[PDB]
Structure formats: C-alpha cells, structure tokens
Amino acid sequence: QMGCKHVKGILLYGPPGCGKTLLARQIGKMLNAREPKVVNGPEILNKYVGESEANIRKLFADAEEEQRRLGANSGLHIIIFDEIDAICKQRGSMAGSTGVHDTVVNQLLSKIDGVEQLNNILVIGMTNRPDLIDEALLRPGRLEVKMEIGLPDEKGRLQILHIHTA
Amino acid sequence: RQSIINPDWNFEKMGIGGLDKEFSDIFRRAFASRVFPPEIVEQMGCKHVKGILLYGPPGCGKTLLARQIGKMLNAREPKVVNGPEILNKYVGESEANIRKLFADAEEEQRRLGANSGLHIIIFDEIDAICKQRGSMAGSTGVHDTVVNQLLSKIDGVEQLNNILVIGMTNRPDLIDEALLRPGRLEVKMEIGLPDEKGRLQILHIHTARMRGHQLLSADVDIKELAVETKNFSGAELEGLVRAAQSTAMNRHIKASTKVEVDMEKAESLQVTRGDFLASLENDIKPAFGTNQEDYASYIMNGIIKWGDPVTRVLDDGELLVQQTKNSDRTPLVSVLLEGPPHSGKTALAAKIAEESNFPFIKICSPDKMIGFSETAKCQAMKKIFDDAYKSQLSCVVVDDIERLLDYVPIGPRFSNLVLQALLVLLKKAPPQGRKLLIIGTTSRKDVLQEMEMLNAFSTTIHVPNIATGEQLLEALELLGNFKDKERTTIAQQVKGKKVWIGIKKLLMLIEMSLQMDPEYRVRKFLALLREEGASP
Amino acid sequence: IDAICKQRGSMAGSTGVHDTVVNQLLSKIDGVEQLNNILVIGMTNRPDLIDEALLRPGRLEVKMEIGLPDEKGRLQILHIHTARMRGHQLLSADVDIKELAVETKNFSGAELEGLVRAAQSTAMNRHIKASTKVEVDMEKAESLQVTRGDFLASLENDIKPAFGTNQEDYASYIMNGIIKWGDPVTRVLDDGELLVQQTKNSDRTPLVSVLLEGPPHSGKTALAAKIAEESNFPFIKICSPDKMIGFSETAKCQAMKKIFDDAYKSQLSCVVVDDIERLLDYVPIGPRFSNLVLQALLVLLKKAPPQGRKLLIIGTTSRKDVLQEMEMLNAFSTTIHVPNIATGEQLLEALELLGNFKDKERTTIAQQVKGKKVWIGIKKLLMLIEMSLQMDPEYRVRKFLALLREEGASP
Ligand SMILES: Nc1ncnc2c1ncn2[C@@H]1O[C@H](COP(=O)(O)OP(=O)(O)OP(=O)(O)O)[C@@H](O)[C@H]1O
Numbered sequence A: 001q002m003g004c005k006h007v008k009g010i011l012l013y014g015p016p017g018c019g020k021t022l023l024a025r026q027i028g029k030m031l032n033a034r035e036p037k038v039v040n041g042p043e044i045l046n047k048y049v050g051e052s053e054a055n056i057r058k059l060f061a062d063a064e065e066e067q068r069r070l071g072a073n074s075g076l077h078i079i080i081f082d083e084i085d086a087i088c089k090q091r092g093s094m095a096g097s098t099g100v101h102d103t104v105v106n107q108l109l110s111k112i113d114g115v116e117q118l119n120n121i122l123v124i125g126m127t128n129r130p131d132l133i134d135e136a137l138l139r140p141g142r143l144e145v146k147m148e149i150g151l152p153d154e155k156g157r158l159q160i161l162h163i164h165t166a
Numbered sequence B: 001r002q003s004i005i006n007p008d009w010n011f012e013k014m015g016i017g018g019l020d021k022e023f024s025d026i027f028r029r030a031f032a033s034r035v036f037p038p039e040i041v042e043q044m045g046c047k048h049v050k051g052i053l054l055y056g057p058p059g060c061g062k063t064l065l066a067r068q069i070g071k072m073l074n075a076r077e078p079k080v081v082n083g084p085e086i087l088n089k090y091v092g093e094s095e096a097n098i099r100k101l102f103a104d105a106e107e108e109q110r111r112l113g114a115n116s117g118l119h120i121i122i123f124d125e126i127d128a129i130c131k132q133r134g135s136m137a138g139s140t141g142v143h144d145t146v147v148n149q150l151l152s153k154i155d156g157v158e159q160l161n162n163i164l165v166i167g168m169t170n171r172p173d174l175i176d177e178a179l180l181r182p183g184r185l186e187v188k189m190e191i192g193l194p195d196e197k198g199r200l201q202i203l204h205i206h207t208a209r210m211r212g213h214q215l216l217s218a219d220v221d222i223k224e225l226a227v228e229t230k231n232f233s234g235a236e237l238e239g240l241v242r243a244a245q246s247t248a249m250n251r252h253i254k255a256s257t258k259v260e261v262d263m264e265k266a267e268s269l270q271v272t273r274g275d276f277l278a279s280l281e282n283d284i285k286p287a288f289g290t291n292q293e294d295y296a297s298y299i300m301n302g303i304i305k306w307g308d309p310v311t312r313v314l315d316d317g318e319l320l321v322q323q324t325k326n327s328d329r330t331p332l333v334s335v336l337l338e339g340p341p342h343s344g345k346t347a348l349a350a351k352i353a354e355e356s357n358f359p360f361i362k363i364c365s366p367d368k369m370i371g372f373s374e375t376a377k378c379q380a381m382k383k384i385f386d387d388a389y390k391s392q393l394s395c396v397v398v399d400d401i402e403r404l405l406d407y408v409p410i411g412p413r414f415s416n417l418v419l420q421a422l423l424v425l426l427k428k429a430p431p432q433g434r435k436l437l438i439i440g441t442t443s444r445k446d447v448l449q450e451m452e453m454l455n456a457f458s459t460t461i462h463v464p465n466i467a468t469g470e471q472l473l474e475a476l477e478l479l480g481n482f483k484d485k486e487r488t489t490i491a492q493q494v495k496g497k498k499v500w501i502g503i504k505k506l507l508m509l510i511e512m513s514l515q516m517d518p519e520y521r522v523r524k525f526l527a528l529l530r531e532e533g534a535s536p
Numbered sequence C: 001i002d003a004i005c006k007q008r009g010s011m012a013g014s015t016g017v018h019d020t021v022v023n024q025l026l027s028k029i030d031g032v033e034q035l036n037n038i039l040v041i042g043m044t045n046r047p048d049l050i051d052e053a054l055l056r057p058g059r060l061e062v063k064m065e066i067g068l069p070d071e072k073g074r075l076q077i078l079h080i081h082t083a084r085m086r087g088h089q090l091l092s093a094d095v096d097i098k099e100l101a102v103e104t105k106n107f108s109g110a111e112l113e114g115l116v117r118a119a120q121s122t123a124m125n126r127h128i129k130a131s132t133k134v135e136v137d138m139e140k141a142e143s144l145q146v147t148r149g150d151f152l153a154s155l156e157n158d159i160k161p162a163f164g165t166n167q168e169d170y171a172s173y174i175m176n177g178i179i180k181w182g183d184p185v186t187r188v189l190d191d192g193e194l195l196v197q198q199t200k201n202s203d204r205t206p207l208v209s210v211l212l213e214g215p216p217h218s219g220k221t222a223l224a225a226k227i228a229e230e231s232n233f234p235f236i237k238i239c240s241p242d243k244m245i246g247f248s249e250t251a252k253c254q255a256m257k258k259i260f261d262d263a264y265k266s267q268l269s270c271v272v273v274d275d276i277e278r279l280l281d282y283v284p285i286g287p288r289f290s291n292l293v294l295q296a297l298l299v300l301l302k303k304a305p306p307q308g309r310k311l312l313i314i315g316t317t318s319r320k321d322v323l324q325e326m327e328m329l330n331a332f333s334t335t336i337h338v339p340n341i342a343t344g345e346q347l348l349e350a351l352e353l354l355g356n357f358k359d360k361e362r363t364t365i366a367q368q369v370k371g372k373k374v375w376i377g378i379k380k381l382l383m384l385i386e387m388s389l390q391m392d393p394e395y396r397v398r399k400f401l402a403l404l405r406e407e408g409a410s411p
C-alpha cells in the first residue's frame, strides 16, 4: 500500500583488519535465502573478446528467471564483491585496460538497473580505496548505503576481548 | 486502419514529471506523421524519422522515458540490448548479432509493403559499441567492423520504413559523427536537472499512493519540501521518500534478540515531517546542490563584528550579488579580495557566498590537489567550471591564488599553464541566459599586478587588520576571555599605543597565553603582543 | 569497402583472415584469367586507408570525390524535394525558395531534406491536439498548408549544420551590437571594406594580412567579427584561445593547422586570429612564451594557397611592442588602430545612444565633464554604468562621477 522499492546495494570501506569481510559473511548467513555468490577479486577477466561480460551477465540469470516465474513471491538473491576497486573504476580516466574495463563497467551498470526491473537482489561491495570507484555506481537506485568501519574505542576493545576469550 | 497509439494511453498514467517540453518535442518530431491520415501523408511524399538520442547527467530519467515510450505504442515487444551484449570471440560472430536484429523488419517490409507495423529497438549505454572509427587501438579489429555493420544496416542501399531506434548515453562526445547525421539519428535531446515546478510534480507523483490510503500525516507540506530541496535529481527525491518511509516503519520493530514486530501499533502507521527532516540531515546528500559541511569547515570560529570594516566588506559583497542577479548587459562579474596575511579573508568570501542564496555554490581550493602536476590542476579547474555552466545562477570561489600558481620569491618560479588557463577562464561568458559570479582571494597584490592579472578582475576589496587599541579591546570583549579586573590592566597598557594584528593571530595568542598559571597570564599576553611587532 | 580492404601490414593481434581476403579480391578482379563483363562500385569515407595495390589502373580507375554543394546545387536540391507539395497545392505562396537557398549555408543534401521534413511536421502538428488523449481534427485537416513561419522556426530550433553555423559565434562575439559614438568607427569599417575588396578583386596578390591594434578594453574583437560578417565570403572562421583551455604546444599547433587546411579547401576565405598574446603564452616576468606556436604563425602568415584561390587574415592584439620585438610586425601587410574615447562630446553621445541618465542628470554630467579630458574604453563604460545603477536614485550620478574620477587617465 506504499508503492516503495527495496534498496539494492551496500558499500563498506575502511582501513585493513577492522571487520568488513566478517560483517558481510555474517549478514550472508543471517537470511533465510539460498547460498550467496562470491567473487574473489578480479576472477572474471578473460583473454578472449566478449568473455568478461558473459561472466558478469552469468551472475544474475537465476534472479531473472525466478522474477519472471514467480513475481512478488520470489526469494532473495545475494552477490558479494570482494575488492571491488579492482574492476569498477572511473570511466574514461585509465587506459581502459585496452577497452576491457569500460565494457565491464557498462555491463554491470546495465544489469543492476535497466529497462527490465528486478526486485529480489542484494549486492554487497567492500574496498580499501573508496575514491577510485565510478560515480554512477554510487547513486540512489544503486549501491547507495555507504558505511565506514574504523578503529574502535575502549568499549569496543572491551567487547572484542570479551568475544575472543569466552 | 488500426491506430498506432494504444486505445487507453493517457499522459498522466505514464508517471513522468518535469519533462513536458521534451516529450512534446519528441512526440511532434517522431509520431506526428504516423497519426495523420495516410492519404495526405502519401501526397506529401515524406519519409519517417528513425532515431532518437538521449543524453545528460546520471539519474535524471532517461531509461524511464524509453520504457514508457516502448509501452505507449501498439506494436511488437521491443528488443533490448544491455551494453556490450553482442560481442563474441569467434571471427565474424559479433556482426551476425547486429544483422539478426533487423531480420523481422526486413521480412515484414518485403511482405506487406507499406501496411506493416512498427518495430522498436533500444540500445542501452550505446557508447560501448559505437565509439569513433580509428581510435582505441584494440588490436583485434572488432571495434570498427561492428560500427561499419551498424551504419550499413540502419541506412543502406535497401530502404526500410518500419523501424525506430532509441539510444541513451552519458558521454555524447564519443559517438561516431556519421551516426548522428539527419538520416540516422536525427532527434537529440538533453535531460537535465529540474526546477521547483518540476520537483513539486515529482514529489506529488511519488506521494500520491501514500496519500490515497491516509498513510501520510496532516503536518507535511509538499511545497516547503520542494522549496527546500534545491538541485535535486529525480532519483534523489525518490530516495528521500524511501528513507522517510523506512524511518517510519522501523519504529514498530524491536530487534535485540529476535526480529519481533509490534503488530498492534502497526495499525496506526503514519509518516511525519520529522522523518523527512532526519532524512535530509543524515541520508541523502546531493551532487549539484550545496552542503553545510563546506561552510562549517571554512568558517570555523564564526564571524564577530569588531569594527566597521567588516560591515563595509559585507555590504559591497551584497551589492555585487545583486548586480549579478538583476542585469543583462553584463552576465559575468568578478571581484578580488586582498589584504595582509592572517587578516581573515577566506571566511568573509565564504560568508558572502553563503548569503548569496544561489542554487549552485562551489569552492575551488588547493587543499585537494597535493602532489598534482599542472595538467591535473587545469583539468580539475576546468571540470569545476564546466559543472557551473549547467545552472541558471552560479557562484565560484577561488581561494589562495598564489598557492594555485606554485609561486616562490626565489628565481622567481611559478606555473605558466595554470596562469594562462585562469586568465582565459575569467572572460569566458556562460551560455546565453545564465549568470556567474567569481570571488578570488589573495595576499600578494603586487605579484598579481606584475603578472598583468588585475585587468581580468572587475573590482578589488580590502580586508584590513586591527589598527587601534579600542578595536582590540572590543574584540577581546566579544570573544570573552579576560575579565574586567584583567581588562583594565590590558587597557592601561594598550590604550596609549597603536597595534597591528590579525584576528587569526589574536586567537592563537590568546590560547597560548591561557596555558600559564592563573596569576601569570596577563604578563605573558602583553609580552607576546609586544614581541609580535607592528611594522605597518 | 574499407571494412574488409586495408593495408596488409595492419592489426598484429590477427588470425590471418584480413590479408587472405585482400589477396583473393586482388587475384579475382585482375588475375591470369581475364573477364570483360564486370563492373565494381565502391563507397568509402576514409579513402587513405585503402590498399594501394587495389587502386592501380585496371582495377579501380575512376576515383570521384563528392563534396558539399554550392548555392546553385542547394537551389536544385530544394526544388527537387518540394515538387510533390507544389503539385498538390500544399505549399503556401509566400515561401521563397531563393531566400532559403541563400540562408542555408554549409548545408548538405541530408540536412536540407531534414529541414523540409521538420517544416512539414511543424505544420501537421497544429491539427493533432492531444494532452491526455490522441485525437486528430479531420475538419481543418483538408486545409493543411506549410507557411514561411514554419520554415523559419524549424531553421532556428531544430536543424543545425555540421560545418559550423557562426550564428551563436556572432551572438557571443558581438554581444551589445555596434554604436557609432564617433568618427573612428566609420574609418575602421571603411579600411576593412577596402581590404576585403582588394582581396576579392586582385589576382597578383592572393594573400593579404592586417593587424588590429589598440589599448585594452577598446573593442577590437567585435570590429574584426563585424568586418568578417560583412565580408560575405563563402567560408569564415574564428581561431580563439578560449576553445583550447589546457592544451599543450602540439595540440594548439594541430588545431591551427587543421583550421588553415580547411580554409585552403574553399575558393576565397577569411580567417580571424584574436588575442595573439594569449595564443602564445606570454608573461612579462621572464619573459616566457611558446616558441613552437610563434614559428607556426610566422610560417603560416606567408604561405600562399593553391593557385586560383584567395585568403584574408585578420589578427587582433593589444601589445604592439611585444610583437615588434619578436619581429612578427613585419609579417603583416598593414595595421589599423582602434582608439579609446578622448573627449567629453563622444562620451555624451555614447550615453545618448545607450539610453541612460536622461534629462537633468545628463545636464549635470555634461556640466561636470566638459572642463576636462577623458580616457575610457567602450567596454568598461558599460561596466561602470551597471555598477552605478545599483545605488539609490539619489546617489547614482555621484557614484558614476566618483568611479569616472577614480578611473584616471594616461594617454
Ligand atoms: N569488530 C570485530 N569484532 C571481532 N573480531 C573482529 C572484528 N573486526 C575484525 N575482527 C577479527 O579480524 C579478523 C579478520 O578481519 P576481517 O577479515 O574481517 O577484516 P578486513 O577489513 O576484511 O581486512 P582486509 O582489509 O585486509 O580485507 C576476523 O576474523 C576477526 O577475528
């Protein structure tokens, strides 16, 4: 009765060792949905023409099929991008990785939000260099919830020490 | 005989606001000849348009328009191409993909002739497969063959009259120049930020359903929200509404052990104006608007009136703002604020810009260009100035010019490229109908005069130091640190002398003096003040 | 034809398919076996890239270049693309085709056809009235007629040439028009007319140059633009420093070379080079500048176009002595001086033609100025007037006079 869509992405950034991968792992296994998909850094690149984009497109197929078949009764699908700064970077700045990186960025942008509408996905990204990411991927309707994980204070250190000596 | 438009199509049903003129132009130029009676159009002996291009900044509603156009026509199911979806690794397999899209249109044209329907094709992110021919030395050779095939298929020896192509891009300057001629993609449109009368429409469109079911409180006024949200794109208004709804819905869910919904209270769910205010404070931050963070960072300790000169500077600033906003014989005006070091001339420029009340305000500072070469500095300046030509009223502040040119008295040495760019950028007028104000600050007027740079600026304003004992006493009183017993002792010594000190240094002197013992502070303050010297 | 046929030394990330195709075409067109009943037609946009072995006589002999038409060709195309309308009495009688042919300069056939199509659509759209439901009238639909206003509106809004328009350029270079505040303006325009005539008529000196010099804020760019506009040549272009922000030496040289190469293609052309001291980066300290651009200018100022073609060049600057020290003042044929305002009568006439400080205020100003000499440029006078107008009605003449005094003088 409100006509509102669901948020479609999260981004986490901060210095090393402060608990970004742990939080994503724990969120992945808190939900009733099926197993999540994990991309371990730049593991989609391929030497042949038009193969990286196919690897990108292959991540969303199940979501599209379930959305078409069921509609508003579908489940939830999760994708996790680890070290996302190694793939998505500002378009038209670098040498384009020989025209490869621009195509990958365009494909990802087209798949996340395009003419065909999805409502059953959640994308999580984690990075150490937040300033190198494309500006068109961090807008509302896309990865729009940005969070910073920093050093803890005395209470946080006490909580961690209680956690690790139980 | 069947009408091309759907029987039940209605403009208000599309759900688009703030783009009335764009849709009117598109409809007139694309669909005017497909609705007129066939015999007269045949007598005119004219052909149909077969192309549309949409460009603009992100989030302003390009894909939405294409989708609504696709669903407005009683035709087939439009084909959709998502980015570089056609490439293939086998030789000659990425061109068959291009050829395959027109195979139905060609067949129907051959069979039914002039009584065929309409076939739509949508290219999303077209600049991924249609860059100029020759650039981008991909050594595969698959990036020119595709462009040639597309060009030869859109308009070639064999003629088609039952197609329509829609393209959408963010970088219109990279498309091939042969694809945009009046025979291939004739209609070109720019989708930009809306104004108040468009923001109101967007907010109404996105709040109609909530209003229908009495889920919106009675103390929320849409007009005030439209006035308050300046230079917001279409996406950000929807994001704001979403954040407000989430804040409203989160009050009935307690989650310390196991997600548990109140359920009872959920009956009386209402969205209040406090949620909207909280969402504007924390969640949504625009890109072409103004942010309180910059003003808070550049005016740290506020502005105190320790004398008359402050008021003079502010009044002159106001006069220049008014001239910029209400004149057509001079669309571009610039001023230079100058004075001795530590006199506080950055905060004053920031205050003037803040009080101007223009929609777009930006500050170009060297704090964000550490280690840059002069080429990168020119690129950053050019980008900041280009972003300001897409607004009806703009203000730009250039801070610490001598740090921008990399100046050092020895030699002397500086950067010529940045100087020339800045000299050429102070006289380029904006597109007709737009206004721009520039405020530059510096502390070395003689150097700028020697560089023939005072002919570019229109006027100069002077920011002075504290020059009398009464002014120093008034500043101390307004700051409120030394009490009457100590203020009398200070006045005994300073009243019979002239002083020469800046506010930014007076604050430092006061905090240095405040660290000694309670009965030793006045002596140290006087010693520091005397040692500072005057040397006017 | 350039998609498949290209030089054999090419893409090295190749599987060997783009060379065997060229060899098979060469061997099939003209090989050991002989044919006498074939004809091959090829179309291309990049003739240079094609293989040289395919262009020798006996394989591809007749090479033809299709270019932009002239006024007569434009008239022919406009007549071809309106015959059907004219035959059925669908075209109004106030439409003058010759005026269109004159106005549409640098257009090609496709752009002219698009102009006609847009004009037709603007007329068809006056009957289709639909804000919430499509519905054609069909009552007035039998009285459809395309008028002159439709053509004018479509020319202003929709269709734009791809070879430069100069409408917006002339809009932005001459922003406040030209006002005859004195005698010097007429002299400058007369000298420009004489130079244009000499370029047009004389055949023994195909190349002519001139330099417009004067103190800053005198209005030297507007006068040059006006002279170029009144020249009425087929080709006119302005080379400005404000379209090369951030460029290096090589990029600037390339841009000027491209502009001059385009100029050499036509039959008689005019070119404007404004702000020479900003084109080559001059700064008094040092001094510093770019030698590459200076050498390019000195070389291009004396190069004659191919026989039977004529070129005029107009350069503007505000520092004559600097150009003299580089020995550039000797590369120009002659010079023209653009002076400032020097007398009270000229200032009063300028105020009269500008339309400000009417009646008694003018009398007060005249009383205060006539007993002195003045030294002010035209461009700064507008700034002073707009600055003075922001005061209250009782403090407008006083502020204007104070600013004028503070301006100073230095003949
Ligand atoms: N907030 C925390 N509470 C408890 N343990 C933590 C916390 N943050 C980090 N750790 C510990 O740190 C380990 C590794 O940290 P983690 O991999 O989450 O960091 P990271 O930010 O991904 O590091 P990197 O930037 O190198 O990828 C975890 O397995 C956990 O033991």
Ligand SMILES: Nc1ncnc2c1ncn2[C@@H]1O[C@H](COP(=O)(O)OP(=O)(O)OP(=O)(O)O)[C@@H](O)[C@H]1O
Pocket: A113, A136, A141, B015, B016, B017, B018, B019, B057, B058, B059, B060, B061, B062, B063, B064, B065, B170, B202, B205, B233, B234, B235, B238
């Ligand atoms: N004029 C508008 N009226 C109503 N909603 C709008 C408008 N413009 C944008 N929106 C909202 O923005 C959402 C996303 O915008 P959209 O995808 O159309 O932008 P875009 O221009 O394609 O952006 P991108 O540059 O990323 O492609 C739409 O679903 C809609 O909710």
Ligand SMILES: Nc1ncnc2c1ncn2[C@@H]1O[C@H](COP(=O)(O)OP(=O)(O)OP(=O)(O)O)[C@@H](O)[C@H]1O
Pocket: B298, B299, B300, B301, B302, B303, B304, B305, B306, B310, B340, B341, B342, B343, B344, B345, B346, B347, B348, B443, B503, B504
């Ligand atoms: N009346 C006032 N006018 C200006 N600044 C004031 C006033 N009252 C307090 N201040 C504070 O004084 C400080 C002035 O420092 P600011 O950086 O603006 O000076 P500056 O001359 O630009 O410095 P520098 O010459 O070292 O670059 C700021 O913290 C400002 O908030």
Ligand SMILES: Nc1ncnc2c1ncn2[C@@H]1O[C@H](COP(=O)(O)OP(=O)(O)OP(=O)(O)O)[C@@H](O)[C@H]1O
Pocket: C173, C174, C175, C176, C177, C178, C179, C180, C181, C185, C215, C216, C217, C218, C219, C220, C221, C222, C223, C318, C378, C379
């Ligand atoms: N009689 C006139 N002659 C020339 N320009 C005039 C005249 N009357 C009004 N103008 C206007 O005055 C302006 C002249 O400024 P212009 O930019 O041509 O000067 P400039 O000498 O190039 O200045 P700068 O030294 O800054 O380069 C134009 O807007 C022009 O339309």
